[PDB]
Task: structure prediction
Amino acid sequence: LLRQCPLLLPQNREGTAYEGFVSAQGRDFHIRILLPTDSQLKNARIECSWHLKKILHGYQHILKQRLHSCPDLVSFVVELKTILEIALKNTQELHVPWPPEYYSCLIRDLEILGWNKVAYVDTGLTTVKLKAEDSRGRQHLITLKLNAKYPTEPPDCVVDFPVQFAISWMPQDSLIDIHNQFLAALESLKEFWDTMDEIDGKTWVLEPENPARCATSRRIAIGNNVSVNIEVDPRHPKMLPECYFLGADHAVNPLRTKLNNNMHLWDPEISLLQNLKDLLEIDFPSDQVCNEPRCGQPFHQACLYEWLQGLPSSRQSFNVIFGECPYCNKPLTVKSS
Result:
């Protein structure tokens, strides 16, 4: 009962419902609370106390608790402790307790300067944007962690790579030589990346146009009015790939016949534009203004290539019209942009 309350048990003259200087080692809040002399919920401090210790910053769902008036004298303290423990976990989201003065940031600068700052992008202790180092088209990423400079391996392993392109087994948090320690061994995936880049050098199709080095999508669409969905998502395969190139409706017969007969003339080692692309005679071709009075809302005016809807784009505006509202997030679809 009384135990576990490092700051509680006020003057018993009028209940002593203060409990000043009570916290779970994170923040010793104030005692700006009243002692209700009634049956229950006489004079609380939820949004009514001084709040000198940042108590008023509690903008959570206060109505959900309802002041915990259903409980008893002990139930009130139980609910208060539960709310405090719940708010202690939420602190990880905000930045009201990230001290960082653990001496690791200072020691991290030594390892950071040891590399000579070859290619750095991020700063402010967030992460290092070091990538692109390779004998071909380089596209990588970096980040920072919490236990940097200590035995805690850095968890900010954000970088373009396959489903297994991620290093582990941090030998005492080896910060320096990160590109050579684990980035040099990435040649296995770099070879496939360069092969895909060389295969996608020409023959513009309806496949992913934006940079998708982390993934793979085969969209030839050489046939007029159709799109050959010959995906190349398979990274581990050397050559001899095949996708569902269902571009032309009637052309499915000749393409299907060429794919069936292509079994003998597969040309796996020459499938890079020879046995796969041109194997079966395949040539590469060449402001949130709604309707109601609430018409005030901003939106990114950079590009609206898919402003018709969030999920649907370039489809019939009759059924699939209101895709989503990611630019405003209000009660309105994308049928007006």
Notes: Helices lie at 62-65, 73-90, 104-114, 178-183, 187-199, 252-261, 271-275. The radius of gyration is 31 Å. Residues 217 and 325 are 27 Å apart (CA to CA).
